[PDB]
């Protein structure tokens, strides 16, 4: 409650130069169902597993992308009407200067 | 560690008429090391800030707890609640 | 200020009630401005060069 929802992070098996259409539909369904998710401030960090490393890319939804992903039902890898104007890469950077924490479910675990 | 061992000296300054009201109980408590350490290490003393509101209300809760302990012991008497 | 004033327990909890009413009012204000930001985000998707060249060449 002291913090605001900044979106979500997820891992990818391998690096794509574009945001997934499943990620923009997931982000826009979460936005359409939760009014505490401001589309300017919420992102999708993708931690793609490159060889021996991790490549992190944060993406934001444009107002075109939230409208398309809200109306979308095609859960495939190439749905109709999916453009690279549906997202914009936002600046994301790392830190030794402060520490974050985690929240797991209480009764069960996360996986 | 005066906030746990307070009631003796509050009773003693009350019978001296040093503490004649609860305002002078806070004013007497400002002379202690407890007041000087509540502003430098607040969370040792269950404080939440070094501001005048936090410090004044924690001192006022301290004195109105110890004087409730002294009036419930019938050691002192509180008129007009002050 | 400098000298901490005594505040009575009724007065202390009245100040605490007024404080928590204030910050629940700014939480409500921030939530309805969040609704405003959300509606705003939602319905946005629904000679001279030659004379400078002359100065640079000079």
Question: Does the beta-carbon distance from C8 to B52 stay under 8 Å?
Answer: no
Question: Does the beta-carbon distance from C34 to A63 stay under 8 Å?
Answer: no
Burial class (CB in 10 A: 0-12, 13-18, 19+), B40: exposed
Resolution in A: 4.6
Cβ neighbours of A47 (radius 10 Å): 13
Chains A, C: CB contacts within 8 A come to: 27
Chain B partners of C3 at a C-beta cutoff of 8 Å? 27, 30
Asked if residue A66 lies in contact with residue C42, where contact means CB atoms within 8 angstroms, the answer is: yes
- Alpha carbon of residue B33 to chain centroid: 12
What is chain C's alpha carbon radius of gyration, rounded to the nearest angstrom?
Answer: 29
Nearest chain C Cα distance for residue B59, angstroms: 7
Which technique was the structure solved with, according to the deposited record? cryo-EM
Helix/strand/coil (H, E, C) string of C12-46? HHHHHHHHHHHHHHHHHHHHHHHHHHHHHHHHCCC
φ, ψ for residue C45, nearest 5 deg: -120, -15
Put simply, the chain C residues between 6 and 25 with a CB less than 8 A from any chain B CB are: 6-9, 12, 15
């Amino acid at each position: 409650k002291e913090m605001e929802p900044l979106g979500w992070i997820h891992t990818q098996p391998n690096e794509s130069p574009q945001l997934s259409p499943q990620d923009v539909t997931t982000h826009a369904k979460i936005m359409a169902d939760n009014p505490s998710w401001d589309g300017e401030k919420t992102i999708i960090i993708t931690c793609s597993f490159t060889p021996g490393s991790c490549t992190l890319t944060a993406y934001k939804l444009t107002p075109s992308g939230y409208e398309w992903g809200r109306q979308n039902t095609d859960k495939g890898n190439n749905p109709k009407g999916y453009l690279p104007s549906h997202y914009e890469r936002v600046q994301m950077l790392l830190s030794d200067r402060f520490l974050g924490f985690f929240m797991v479910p209480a009764q069960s675990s996360w996986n | 560690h005066l906030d746990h061992c307070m009631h003796d000296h509050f009773n003693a300054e009350i019978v001296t008429k040093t503490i004649e009201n609860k305002q002078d109980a806070v004013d007497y408590l400002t002379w202690t090391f407890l007041y000087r350490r509540m502003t430098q290490n607040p969370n040792y003393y269950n404080l939440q800030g070094i501001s005048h509101r936090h410090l004044s209300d924690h001192l006022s809760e301290l004195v109105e707890q110890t004087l409730s302990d002294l009036e419930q012991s019938k050691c002192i008497s509180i008129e007009d609640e002050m | 200020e400098a000298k901490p004033k005594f505040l009575s327990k009724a007065e202390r909890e009245a100040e605490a009630l007024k404080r928590r009413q204030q910050e629940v009012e700014e939480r409500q204000r921030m939530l309805e401005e969040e609704r405003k930001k959300r509606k705003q985000f939602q319905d946005l998707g629904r000679d001279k060069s030659k004379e400078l060249h002359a100065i640079k060449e000079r």
